[PDB]
Design a binder for this molecule. Structure first.
Ligand SMILES: [Cl-]
Ligand SMILES: [Cl-]
Ligand SMILES: [Cl-]
Ligand SMILES: [Cl-]
Ligand SMILES: [Cl-]
Ligand SMILES: [Cl-]
Ligand SMILES: [Cl-]
Ligand SMILES: [Cl-]
Ligand SMILES: [Cl-]
Lengths: 299, 307, 299
């Protein structure tokens, strides 16, 4: 699993090689860049396995691929063809409106997006091995990534000031999202929209067991003062300064999709973002690589 | 028929039913491995600007003569006459579908008096139970035909499975309470009419409201179907997924969610390579628990549909 | 512990002996009959130990004594002088407005009043060895005893139709009464009137542990189809027919306070109620003993 660096979105062999040449730590194989996914519209699904394999053969760095949220068979396909990591992302069209994939039963690692601590804890409990503190992919606006990293940092800072009993109270609150389907159905059957805490609602787990599960993850967060899994910033990174900004905010690394290939000079731009990510604390370097970089993505 | 209706349905389970608009497609569907075809003038993706009605009987007969596998056809909801026409020309099964323009805003066809079996759509348990009590021999947990977005089909199967899981934890008295709630939909016309006559929008439970049945009798009917659902832990009839199946992985997903099979409309003929695509969906449906097979048939399929 | 029969309230040696002569299964020693306690007013407390001991020496049947609700030192005194059973009753002036005595740490058995299933379960969990389904002592009106026995029977009948998961939901609901003090105090400190389920609130037990505790008692009730401890009816029994009525409703026996000594012929009246309680299913006997019984308590 990647721990530092820049993960780049690529749509073909040429881009995958450009990414590696630039210094990417890994690539994200997909048929449509996020920026083009928001505009195009339609239903964005898992990419053709043949395209992903072609990319896997074209580079010597890890290859990631995304599947729709809740689409466990798309994920089983990506695992079967051997991708290094699956990204269950909101970038694509959600397949299951109630539940995310139960990632723990898979062998391949998953990276999941999260807008706040509650989402991160829930994704981690279901099996995520890496978290993507995302904002809004395809916009080229770093504010969304910043808003969420701020929300994440503040939530963790406040969690560290709580007693375990108060942390359990947070776990209990975060667990409610899992009972949404059960309550909706009960209402549809003419009964109150409530649930018993000892009835199965997700993968055989009862609300009570889910609470204990989120509680154990929150205790890890409290002890570490951060998420217990690698956490990269994503969505909106368009310039070397944006990348460096996310690192200063505590990100372990960054994901870049539209910012590179939707800009004027992809290779040069990519190298610059890679250098800024490794030297986020060196203004002179960030400044030099941003010099004469050319047009950046609109957004 | 009674036993013959469910007899036909059990032979289509585990397979893929494909929508076709002509002899060529029907034939492609057959060589692809479809268990049956759904004949119609325009696929759901195209259906969605005007009034979509039953297809010309001549077009359906041409399709029936072009293939050796069974053929189904659609009729508008509540359109008893269209259904009677389809039965007369000999289709193997009638699909009272919401993809077509609803003809009766108050009631669905009373399917029990027909000889030919019916397949009806359902968004949740309540709808499935009412369609089944009306006579449906098959249910398709519908979603959003024509969008190529599997989310709709998933939502409804999730709702169906969760409701059935909750039903099994109830006593018979509690199930009766659910049947009572489900039956209210049949009294809508009666209440609206009473209000129009200047009286409270209420109804007496012993007055006829549907096909001669009183609300009280309808509740007992729904109650009996619910008891069957409770005993079996699933619907008492074949249940297929329908909606946005556009890829082999989508079909495999529905099967893993418990579907007995899948209906594919726009996903095949609105794609780049119809025959190849159809073949891949058929194999993915038969081997939904085989990641390697699903992956294999997904490679180099070409562009799919969207919406 | 008594299992059948009539328990009578006595205020002196003469009454205690009358009670035994009549056939009482045990006596309840106190300085003021309930009917006179409601009228008199003032603060009703534990009786003088000397009076209780005099009664203990005057009879050959068990002697009970009451203490104020929550008054654990009054109870420790009754235990020290050797009473056979302590009755923590609402007949006397409540001493602790938040909690009842933690009866489990005592050696002597306790009998507690209950108006409904929730109260019975809570009293049983805190240690009660016997329950008194009471209505309104001192009134001579059997309706209060009947109302509560009806409420008790119906609640148990409905509990038997529930799954364990639903029973837990009832246990959770019944447990809330214990957090009243904690919520009041938090509000007094300027914070929301809420509590964390893992913080101590009663005898070191957290709300969560109390819930599991009430849940285990409810499972016993569900399995038995009745309370897991002896259950007598009390308050309002003034005639032989009243006693027989309570037995037909499912009572294991009856407590009689005002009905006997506040009537015209105590001894004769007491014997009649004893006979009616043992032959509650024999109208001819109930009728014969009610014949020429004389004036009954007003109320
Ligand atoms: Cl979430
Ligand atoms: Cl509960
Ligand atoms: Cl973190
Ligand atoms: Cl309906
Ligand atoms: Cl009526
Ligand atoms: Cl089913
Ligand atoms: Cl209480
Ligand atoms: Cl809590
Ligand atoms: Cl009882």
């Amino acid at each position: 699993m990647v721990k530092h660096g820049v993960v780049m979105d690529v749509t073909n062999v040429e881009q995958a090689q450009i990414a590696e040449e630039a210094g990417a730590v890994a690539v994200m194989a997909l048929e449509r860049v996020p920026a083009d996914i928001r505009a195009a519209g339609g239903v964005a699904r898992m990419s053709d396995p043949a395209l992903i394999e072609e990319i896997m053969d074209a580079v010597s760095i890890p290859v990631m691929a995304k599947c729709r949220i809740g689409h466990t068979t798309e994920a089983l396909v990506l695992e079967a063809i051997g991708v290094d990591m699956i990204d269950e992302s909101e970038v694509l069209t959600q397949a299951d409106p109630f539940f995310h994939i139960y990632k723990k039963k898979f062998n391949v690692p998953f990276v999941c997006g999260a807008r706040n601590l509650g989402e991160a804890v829930r994704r981690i409990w279901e099996g995520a091995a890496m978290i993507r503190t995302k904002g809004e992919a395809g916009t080229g606006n770093i504010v969304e990534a910043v808003r969420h990293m701020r929300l994440m940092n503040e939530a963790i800072a406040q969690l560290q000031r709580m007693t375990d009993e108060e942390v359990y109270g947070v776990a209990k609150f975060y667990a409610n999202r899992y009972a949404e389907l059960a309550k909706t159905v009960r209402e549809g059957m003419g009964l109150p929209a409530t649930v018993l805490e000892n009835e199965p609602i997700y993968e055989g787990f009862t609300l009570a067991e889910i609470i204990d599960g989120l509680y154990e993850v929150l205790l890890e967060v409290k002890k570490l003062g951060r998420l217990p899994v690698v956490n990269f910033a994503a969505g909106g990174v368009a310039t070397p300064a944006d990348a460096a900004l996310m690192m200063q905010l505590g990100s372990d690394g960054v994901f870049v999709g539209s910012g590179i290939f939707k800009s004027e000079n992809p290779l040069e731009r990519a190298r610059a973002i890679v250098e800024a990510t490794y030297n986020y604390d060196k203004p002179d370097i960030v400044a030099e690589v941003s010099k004469n970089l050319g047009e950046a993505m609109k957004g």
